[PDB]
Write a protein that binds this ligand. Structure first.
Ligand SMILES: [Zn+2]
Ligand SMILES: [Zn+2]
Ligand SMILES: [Zn+2]
Lengths: 59, 115, 59, 47, 258, 105, 66, 71
RNA sequence: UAACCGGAGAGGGAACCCACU
């Protein structure tokens, strides 16, 4: 359904306003939610006070 | 699914009376007319017509619940005048006035139309 | 019973001319599930008249 | 003697399906296909 | 202790609305007529739809609903029919109903506007409002879709369903200048003048008039096509007068039987 | 419908108060002999939608409308699934006038 | 989806005005001068035709056959 | 046996045949099958676009002209 | 000097996201 014009989205019984972006898995549309995390490859100096450490240079 | 059918606001069931008079006991010469399947259309003209009667000491109407189709009209008159005839005379002349208003609207139409 | 499950048509009283399928009938009344509204009313069994739904010519 | 007629998806041609049949259109080949309206009495209240 | 003598004065009469003025009446009588214009004036409207084939993109109940809202010219019929629930018949009668019929199939290539031209009546006088301006679109069909149904029009009033409501809008008004101070303006000059205001452009509201009642109720009844705008009125006066006569009969029975 | 085992198999079939042993108090003739209700048919709560039997004589295994749901059958489609079994989806429509208790924002 | 028959508030028939109103806008009328050339005064009746979005034209694109 | 004497662009097989004809053109490293497929596809596209405008010839054509001009 | 039928609560478990107050 790609680069396909608007008559043809409607000839395949689809809507041209559908955004896309989801999977059909056993006839269910599933979305992948974006998960955040920490940036890798970067030095971060924190300070946990609830331990034996004054500082911590994670990476 | 619990919706009442819409003809239930004007159609009388089987056994319901249209109108029902109950003598009121707190004050002398007072009655309560309970009209079924009516609303503020008919209850307001009668009350305002009864307040024109000089021998009527109290007149009012209420609608106890709006989901239910019943009004109560409480009339109190002076001891030489029962509220049964106050309520009757308040309708007889309300009729005479509506009939006269109809005659006059009809001649005013047929004069406006080409005239 | 006898008319349970048949299509009737209410022919008197406030629901005149209203179509539904009988769900439960007794000797006196019947419960008609009305076709338009979403409701099952209980009507007298003499206010009803069977309409039926059949096809002829079966060939 | 009614054979349970279906309407194809992509063809819109009535097919006859009896039991123990593959659901496929008698032409063009289509696995999705729908049923016809009822013959009973549909009466609405214009309400 | 008695009645009042109202007087009427039609100021404008077209075939779509009437503007009249009623003088010398109580506010309750003048407002209760206003309510009878909206609910209790009988009119014919499609109320029974049997759908034989519907393949449009609209529902089955979407068509039937849009068909009930099509106004049908009830004008001298509506006072000869009976209510359906009172006809001593089985399955509608020419004496309590009017039968309609729509049969449309789009065969051509362009889309079909099923309009109310297609609703064919069996009485020549109760027709949808097409007589003498487009027509109420019911559906639009594509190539190969269709609609056959037959429908029935019965008598009713706007208290059951709004489809039996003969008016576009009733414009009641009384006392245009705030002479009675029934409404109290916080800044009386920010308010535009009524249409009927016998007031100059200098002053804002009329000076307060302590002993005084409403009269001169100004009305503007606008029809939706179904009845003619002066028949809505003459029928609301008779419909109200008939509610009252019936109440009086039931009352005299309650009195004599106590 | 499926092959449950050697002796067990499901099939779309009007049950009958004769062979299907488990069986409901319902109206089964609303559905036609295909075992599937047809579009345009008014249904209500616990009316049978898809008649289905599984062999043991036959048990009833049919699907019913959710209690108090009350629609009109909108369209019925029949097809096969990856396993090549008959598979149908019925949808039921239900008009909702705005009565009181309904939430508006 | 398709133009309502009546104005919800008022009662006035607006079902016959969607084609006329799209034709006047095609001509040259501005949208406020089209709405009273049709005869719609109350602003209750005027939002029926301004706010209406016509979806049945998109639903007709999904032909069942041809 | 039914498809043999029955034409493939009649009626709803139009888009599916369009993508399948593109797939048949792409699957081929021979230029002759690609050019035959390109000609068949352009002819089918023109026939389908004509059929599509003829059905949209009325009352959708009229609203396209009004939206194009309203913006 | 006669008159045909009788059977009934059925039935389901585990885990996860979304949403409402
Ligand atoms: Zn096939
Ligand atoms: Zn009759
Ligand atoms: Zn309006």
């Amino acid at each position: 359904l790609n680069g396909l014009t608007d008559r043809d989205l409607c000839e395949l019984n689809e809507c041209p306003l559908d955004p896309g972006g989801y999977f059909i898995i056993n006839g269910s549309e599933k979305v992948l939610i974006a998960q955040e995390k920490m940036a890798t490859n970067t030095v971060y100096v924190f300070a946990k006070k609830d331990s034996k450490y004054a500082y911590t240079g994670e990476c | 699914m619990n919706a009442p059918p819409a003809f239930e606001s004007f159609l009388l069931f089987e056994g319901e009376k249209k109108i029902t008079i109950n003598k009121d006991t707190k004050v002398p010469n007072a009655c309560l007319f309970t009209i079924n399947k009516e609303d503020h259309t008919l209850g307001n003209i009668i009350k305002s017509q009864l307040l024109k009667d000089p021998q009527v000491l109290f007149a009012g109407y209420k609608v106890p619940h709006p989901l239910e189709h019943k009004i109560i009209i409480r009339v109190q008159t002076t001891p030489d005048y029962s509220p049964q005839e106050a309520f009757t005379n308040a309708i007889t002349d309300l009729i005479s006035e509506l009939s006269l208003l109809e005659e006059r609207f009809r001649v005013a139409i047929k004069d406006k139309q080409e005239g | 019973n006898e008319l349970i499950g048949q299509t009737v048509r209410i022919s008197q009283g406030p629901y005149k001319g209203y179509i539904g399928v009988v769900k439960d009938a007794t000797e006196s009344t019947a419960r008609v599930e009305l076709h338009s509204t979403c409701q099952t009313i209980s009507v007298d069994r003499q206010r009803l008249t069977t309409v039926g739904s059949r096809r002829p010519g079966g060939m | 003697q009614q054979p349970m007629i279906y309407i194809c998806g992509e063809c819109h041609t009535e097919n006859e399906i009896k039991s123990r049949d593959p659901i496929r259109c008698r032409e063009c080949g289509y696995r999705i296909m729908y049923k016809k309206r009822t013959k009973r009495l549909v009466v609405f209240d214009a309400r | 202790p008695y009645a009042n003598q109202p007087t009427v004065r039609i100021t404008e009469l077209t075939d779509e609305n009437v503007k009249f003025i009623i003088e010398n009446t109580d506010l309750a009588v003048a407002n209760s007529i206003r309510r009878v214009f909206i609910a209790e004036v009988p009119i014919i409207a499609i109320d029974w739809v049997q759908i034989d084939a519907n393949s449009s993109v609209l529902h089955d109940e979407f068509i039937a609903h849009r068909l009930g809202l099509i106004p049908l010219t009830s004008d001298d019929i509506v006072d000869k029919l009976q209510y359906s629930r009172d006809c001593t018949c089985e399955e509608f009668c020419p004496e309590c109903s009017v039968e309609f019929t729509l049969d449309v199939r789009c065969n051509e290539d362009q889309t079909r506007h099923v309009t109310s031209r297609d609703l064919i009546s069996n009485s020549p006088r109760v027709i949808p409002v097409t007589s003498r301006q487009d027509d109420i679109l019911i559906v639009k069909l594509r190539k190969g879709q269709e609609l056959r149904l037959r429908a029935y029009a019965k008598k009713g009033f706007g208290k059951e369903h709004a489809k039996w409501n003969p008016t576009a809008g009733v414009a009641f008004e009384y006392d245009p200048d705030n002479a009675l101070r029934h409404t109290v303006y916080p800044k009386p000059e920010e308010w535009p003048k009524s249409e009927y205001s016998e007031l100059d452009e200098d002053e804002s509201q009329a000076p307060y008039d302590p002993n005084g009642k409403p009269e001169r109720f100004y009305y503007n009844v606008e029809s939706c096509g179904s009845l003619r705008p002066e028949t809505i009125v003459l029928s609301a006066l008779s419909g109200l007068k008939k509610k009252l006569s019936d109440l009086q009969t039931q009352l005299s029975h309650e009195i004599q039987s106590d | 419908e499926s092959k449950k085992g050697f002796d067990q198999e499901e099939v779309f079939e009007k049950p009958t108060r004769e062979t299907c042993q488990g069986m409901r108090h319902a109206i089964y003739d609303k559905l036609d002999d295909d075992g599937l209700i047809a579009p345009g048919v008014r249904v209500s709560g616990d009316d049978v939608i898809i008649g289905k039997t599984v062999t043991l004589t036959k048990r009833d295994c049919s699907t019913f409308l959710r209690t108090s749901e009350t629609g009109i059958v909108d369209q019925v489609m029949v097809t096969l699934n990856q396993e090549g079994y008959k598979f149908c989806k019925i949808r039921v429509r239900s008009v909702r006038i705005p009565q009181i208790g309904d939430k508006f924002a | 989806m398709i133009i309502p028959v009546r104005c919800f508030t008022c009662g006035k028939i607006v079902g016959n005005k969607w084609e006329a109103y799209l034709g006047l806008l095609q001509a040259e009328y501005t949208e406020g001068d089209a709405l009273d050339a049709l005869g719609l005064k109350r602003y209750c009746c005027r939002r029926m035709l301004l706010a209406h979005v016509d979806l049945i034209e998109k639903l007709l694109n999904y032909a069942p056959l041809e | 046996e039914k498809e043999r004497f029955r034409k493939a662009p009649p009626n709803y097989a139009m888009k599916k045949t369009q993508l399948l004809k593109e797939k048949a053109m792409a699957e081929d490293l021979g230029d002759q099958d690609k050019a035959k497929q390109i000609q068949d596809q352009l002819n089918e596209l023109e026939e389908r676009a004509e059929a599509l405008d003829r059905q949209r010839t009325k009352n959708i054509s009229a609203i396209s002209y009004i939206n194009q001009r309203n913006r």
